[PDB]
Structure formats: structure tokens, C-alpha cells
């Protein structure tokens, strides 16, 4: 029975439906599940005021405001501010009840419903760990995790130290394994394997142990990219088996501990660190509290064998043949199988919803592809044409928005164009036609246009199951240029800058060179373009290799005429900035020499910034910890006070503007600064 020792079951248990149902309801110890429930509830309590935005609710959902919002379903709308505060209070109470184990099912539902409502209210805040939090709450709703270390069993003896069915652990282990394995198969991308995603991360001070035996390029290629991919692909197998459990635990602990310090991902690392003692035996808390000194063994609840439970089926050779599995056992087994299959399938469902497929497949947040793609934006231009007068105007990029994610997706762009169309008539503009011109580079590629600039977005066609037509394709057969681009960027001056641009045939780019941007030139690398100076009205054709100097404070255009896309580059210098720097340095040196034998004010304030940075570096970490604690306390106190004010308004009524202003002023006192 070697297989029966490695896997915990035998191949014959899967030969019939009844045997499978009997296996999946095997009694188990509930200690690990209770510890995980407690930790998850505590982390959600800590996370609600910080990342979910309880402290910025008044800014986000202010009454009487013109905002473009991006919900998944346009039929979903936010409530007034007071009802939003009530929703967040109910979510907080549910998380607290989940953590304490008191009224487990009601608290689970009270956390699950408003959390998912708030998640679906906004597409621009979706990430992978918020999706995981929703999934974990949904799973824990159907589990009986209040059978140990809880208030429910303290006040009710029928649910104290009882058994649990086996599929409770199976579902959670399967979820964790799915996350790990599908994160590593997503990182078998050519950008990740070749080292193009996280190229500057090895400059951190945490990687300095590895530089004692490797170069910086080798450290970036091996430790950051290949090491991360291998950990993701092997962590589940290392954790599942008992031979390699200890090494896997150490490796994943180090991985998550480093990730918690390199990035700002909320509570993701702590959630993952506390989901890894769930691959251990279900009795580990009991052994751990047994190994403690006997002095501290008389205050905890007395250790005893768990009592039988109804939810799990009992099969014994001597203790009766067994009972017929009722509806509960079959429903549990079916839920396990179907949920695991759906969670396997969903990350690879992008061929059905083609309307959400831009350069990158799908929306962001449910495919476990973290840090694989990085985006840089060069320019955004929005122009509207009046339908009554024909005049052309220009808007700021992102006037009525609160995020910047609308620049990367076509559904969000359609929503934004519609919201602008309905809002502009309030500003004495008849029915407009809106055109967008956005330049993006992904993973240090050439900059290019993501959408067609000649298409009126408000009247364009977009559907959830049809591939969008006004989305420009990514120029994939230009990536091998990145070596040359990096070499050209590296072999430059400390005062010059470069911009790399790839354009499609039949389109032109119009640029206005600023007054201070003297000594600007354009050089062609591939294809053929013609440059037109607007004032002098002189076309000029360029060939591969030559460069042309442009005037400052004037317009010019670049027309692409080759049958294939053509790439060129911009080189420019800030003559005003260099003159300012040189005169500042000269005057500072002269003054220093004279003494020892607003320009200066800017030099002195930059020096003061340097002094503050270096003195905070010299300051011990205790001051930083104190400041961090003070900021956290201020955030928590403000959230509580605003919630109290809103609840008082809802329950009693709005007293007066003067008292409301006084209370709002009180809530922003910065307790100890």
C-alpha cells in the first residue's frame, strides 16, 4: 500500500460513485481549519479600512458629482454615501463574526454579499488577491470551520470538538494548488523567460547576498525570473508530499517574505503564508500546543478525542456496515468536483469572450498572471468635434475619471466615451464626436497606437463576444530590436533623451516642439517617412540612416508612406534645463570659493531634501516604526468616526450644517503628529 501511503487513499475508492462519496466524507480533525478561519478573519478585519477604501469613501462616492464609473454591468449603480457606509459596516461585522466563530453562517453571508457587490461595482480596482479573497469567503461559507477554537462551540456543546468531512480540506488544497500551478504556466511567456518583465528589480538591497557569486545580469536572469518560475511550478508538489514538506515550507516562506517587502500587495503574502500549514496534518495545532511547557497547559481547553459529527459518514468493519450517504454527502462531493473543474477552466476561457481581448487576453484579475506585463504611456490626446458648429476642441486626458485603466481596454473606452457624450451638453457643447489618440509601450517595446484615431468611439461597435475592430494589432515582429534599442539608450549623454516610435502606414503623427526643447532631431531606423514643416510648408523624405534637425516652438508632421510599418527615433535636449544647471553650479562654486577665501533657493531645497533623506537613513528604525503606527492609527480612527457620523445621520437625521462641519473637522485632527 505504498500508493495508499503517498496519496492517503487507494485506487479502488475511485471505481464507483458510492465509494467516492464515502471517501470524500471521511471524518477529519477540525483544528487546522479553525486556525485558518481565525487568521483569515483577522486579516480581512485589518484589510477592510486600508485597501477596500473605508477611509476614502467620502471622497470616492461624494454626493452631487460628475464622475464616469466603470462597472461590469451598467445596470449596477452605487447607493448614496450613507448607505455605502452601512454596507461597509455590515461587511466589517461579518468579517468580525467570521474571525470570532460566532454565528458562522450568518456572518459568512453578511461578509460575502456586500464584498461581491463592491467588487462588481468597479472594474478598475480588480486584482488577483481581491479575487482570491472573494473565492476564499465563498468556499468558507459552505464549510463547517466553527467546530474548534470558537465562541459557537463554547456556547453550544453539539458543535464542540466534532469531526469534519474530508472534502473541506480537499477544496482548499485544490484551490491553493491551482493558483500556484496556473501562475507558473502563465510565466512560461517569452517575455518572462528572456528576462524582460522585471529587469530593474535586482538593484534592490535585498538581493545583495546573491551578488556575492553572480553578476547583476545573471542575478536578474536566474534568481528573479527562472527562480520564481520554478518555485511557482513546483510549490504544490513540494507541499503535498510529506517527504519534502519541510523544504517546501521554508522555500515558500522565504518567497512570500521577500515579496511582502519588495512590493505593495496589501495582505496577499500573509494570506499565502497562513494557507501553507493546511497541507500539513489536520492535527498540527494539537501537537504544537502539546509540545509547549506543561506550565501553560492548564489554561487552554482540555485536550480530548473529537466527538462524532453528523456531516461526515462513518464506515467501520466492526462498527456497523455503514449508512447510506444522504443528500448532504452527495452534494458535498459534487460541489468539490464541479468547483475544482470550473476553477481549472476559467483562466483559459478567453476564446469565448473575445470582446475583452486587447493586446493582452481578458480583463485583469482572474487569470493569475502577476507582474508579467508592464506598460508605459507616452501621450494621450482626446479631441471632440461639435455636431452643430463643427468646431474642434481638446479635453484633458481623464477629466471625470478617478483611475487610469481606461487607456488599456476597449470596453472601458466605450464606457468613457458614452459618459462624456452624456456629460458634455452640460458644458454648452452639442452632441459631440470623440476621437482618442493613445501611445503605449509594453515591456520596453516600440511606442505605438493602441486604438484607431480616425474612428468615432461613441458610435463605434463593441460586443462582449466579438473581436473589436478599432483595436490596433501589436507589432510582434519588432521585438528583436530591443537589444539595439537598449544599446542606443545606454550609449548616450547625461543631458539627452530618446523616444522610440513605430507607426502604421496611412497615418501621420503631428507634434509641437516646446520652446525650451532646443537641439531636437529625428532619425529613421526602418521604412521611409516624409517630414513636413507646417510653417514653411516643405515636405522632405528620409531614408534608413539619415537624420534631420527640427526647429523649436513650431509644429511638424511625420507621414508614414512605406507599405510596412516604419520605426524612427527622437533625440532632444533641454537647453533651458542645462543652462540653469550650469549657471547654478557656477554660482555655487563661486560663492563657496568666495566664502572659503531663486536658483540658489532651489539648490538649497534640493540639498534639504537630501539632508532629510540621509538623516532618516541615519535615524534608527524605531522612529520609522512609530511614524508607521501613528499613520495606521489615524487611518483607523478616521474610518471609525466617519462611519459613526453616517450611522447617526441614517438613524436620527441630518441635524444641521454647522454641527456636521464641526464633526467632519473633528474627524481629521491627526491625533499625534
Amino acid at each position: 500500500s505504498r500508493i495508499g501511503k503517498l496519496l492517503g487513499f487507494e485506487w479502488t475508492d475511485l471505481s464507483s460513485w458510492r465509494r467516492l462519496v464515502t471517501l470524500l466524507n471521511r471524518p477529519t480533525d477540525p483544528a487546522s481549519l479553525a486556525v485558518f478561519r481565525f487568521l483569515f478573519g483577522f486579516l480581512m478585519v485589518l484589510d477592510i479600512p486600508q485597501e477596500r477604501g473605508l477611509s476614502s469613501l467620502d471622497r470616492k462616492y461624494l454626493d452631487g458629482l460628475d464622475v464616469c464609473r466603470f462597472p461590469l454591468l451598467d445596470a449596477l449603480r452605487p447607493l448614496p454615501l450613507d448607505w455605502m457606509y452601512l454596507v461597509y459596516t455590515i461587511m466589517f461585522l461579518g468579517a468580525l463574526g467570521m474571525m470570532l466563530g460566532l454565528c458562522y453562517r450568518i456572518s459568512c453571508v453578511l461578509f460575502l454579499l456586500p464584498y461581491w457587490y463592491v467588487f462588481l461595482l468597479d472594474k478598475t480596482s480588480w486584482n488577483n488577491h481581491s479575487y482570491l479573497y472573494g473565492l476564499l469567503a465563498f468556499q468558507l461559507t459552505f464549510m463547517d470551520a466553527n467546530h474548534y477554537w470558537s465562541v459557537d462551540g463554547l456556547l453550544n456543546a453539539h458543535r464542540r470538538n466534532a469531526h469534519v468531512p474530508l472534502w473541506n480540506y480537499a477544496v482548499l488544497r485544490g484551490q491553493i494548488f491551482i493558483v500556484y500551478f496556473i501562475a507558473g504556466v502563465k510565466k512560461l511567456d517569452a517575455d518572462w523567460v528572456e528576462g524582460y518583465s522585471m529587469e530593474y528589480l535586482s538593484r534592490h538591497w535585498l538581493f545583495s547576498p546573491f551578488k556575492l557569486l553572480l553578476s547583476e545580469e545573471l542575478t536578474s536572469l536566474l534568481v528573479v525570473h527562472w527562480g520564481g518560475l520554478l518555485l511557482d511550478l513546483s510549490a504544490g508538489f513540494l507541499l503535498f508530499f510529506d517527504v519534502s514538506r519541510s523544504i517546501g515550507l521554508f522555500f515558500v516562506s522565504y518567497f512570500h517574505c521577500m515579496n511582502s517587502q519588495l512590493f505593495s500587495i496589501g495582505m496577499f503574502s500573509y494570506v499565502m503564508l497562513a494557507s501553507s500549514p493546511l497541507f500539513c496534518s489536520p492535527e498540527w495545532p494539537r501537537k504544537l500546543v502539546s509540545y509547549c511547557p506543561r506550565r501553560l497547559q492548564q489554561l487552554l481547553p482540555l485536550k480530548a478525542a473529537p466527538q462524532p459529527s453528523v456531516s461526515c459518514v462513518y464506515k467501520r468493519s466492526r462498527g456497523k456496515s455503514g449508512q447510506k450517504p444522504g443528500l448532504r454527502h452527495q452534494l458535498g462531493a459534487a460541489f468539490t468536483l464541479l468547483y475544482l473543474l470550473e476553477q481549472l477552466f476559467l483562466p483559459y476561457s478567453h476564446f469565448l469572450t473575445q470582446g475583452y481581448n486587447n493586446w493582452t487576453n481578458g480583463l485583469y484579475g482572474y487569470s493569475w498572471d502577476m507582474m508579467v506585463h508592464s506598460r508605459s504611456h507616452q501621450h494621450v490626446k482626446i479631441t471632440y468635434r461639435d455636431g452643430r458648429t463643427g468646431e474642434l476642441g481638446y479635453l484633458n486626458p481623464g477629466v471625470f475619471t478617478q483611475s487610469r485603466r481606461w487607456k488599456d481596454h476597449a470596453d472601458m473606452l466605450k464606457q468613457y466615451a458614452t459618459c462624456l457624450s452624456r456629460l458634455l451638453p452640460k458644458y454648452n457643447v452639442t452632441e459631440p464626436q470623440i476621437y482618442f489618440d493613445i501611445w503605449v509601450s509594453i515591456n520596453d517595446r516600440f511606442q505605438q497606437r493602441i486604438f484607431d484615431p480616425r474612428v468615432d468611439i461613441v458610435q463605434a461597435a463593441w460586443s462582449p463576444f466579438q473581436r473589436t475592430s478599432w483595436v490596433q494589432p501589436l507589432l510582434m515582429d519588432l521585438s528583436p530590436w530591443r537589444a539595439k534599442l537598449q544599446e542606443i539608450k545606454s550609449s548616450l549623454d547625461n543631458h539627452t533623451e530618446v523616444v522610440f516610435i513605430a507607426d502604421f502606414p496611412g497615418l501621420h503623427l503631428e507634434n509641437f516642439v516646446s520652446e525650451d526643447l532646443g537641439n531636437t532631431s529625428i532619425q529613421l531606423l526602418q521604412g521611409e517617412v516624409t517630414v513636413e514643416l507646417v510653417a514653411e510648408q516643405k515636405n522632405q523624405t528620409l531614408r534608413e540612416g539619415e537624420k534631420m534637425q527640427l526647429p523649436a516652438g513650431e509644429y511638424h508632421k511625420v507621414y508614414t508612406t512605406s507599405p510596412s510599418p516604419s520605426c524612427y527615433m527622437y533625440v532632444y535636449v533641454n537647453t533651458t534645463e542645462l543652462a540653469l544647471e550650469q549657471d547654478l553650479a557656477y554660482l555655487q562654486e563661486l560663492k563657496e570659493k568666495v566664502e572659503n577665501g531663486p536658483l540658489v533657493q532651489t539648490f538649497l531645497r534640493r540639498q534639504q531634501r537630501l539632508q532629510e533623506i540621509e538623516r532618516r537613513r541615519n535615524t534608527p528604525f524605531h522612529e520609522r516604526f512609530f511614524r508607521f503606527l501613528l499613520r495606521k492609527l489615524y487611518v483607523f480612527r478616521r474610518s471609525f468616526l466617519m462611519t459613526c457620523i453616517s450611522l447617526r445621520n441614517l438613524i436620527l437625521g441630518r441635524p444641521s450644517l454647522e454641527q456636521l462641519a464641526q464633526e467632519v473637522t473633528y474627524a481629521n485632527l491627526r491625533p499625534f503628529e
Binding site: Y364, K381, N396, N511
Partner: peptide, 21 residues
């Protein structure tokens, strides 16, 4: 305060991961 001109709208010459909060 929601309108550019044409000398600040045409100046082309003047890093992002979605996991970060």
C-alpha cells in the same frame, strides 16, 4: 478647467503593474 489649447495637447515630448494598490 477641462480644456487644453493645441500647444499643450500636441506636445508628445514631455512602469505600471496592475497588482499594486
Amino acid at each position: 478647467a477641462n480644456f487644453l489649447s493645441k500647444q499643450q495637447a500636441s506636445q508628445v515630448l514631455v512602469n505600471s503593474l496592475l497588482e499594486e494598490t
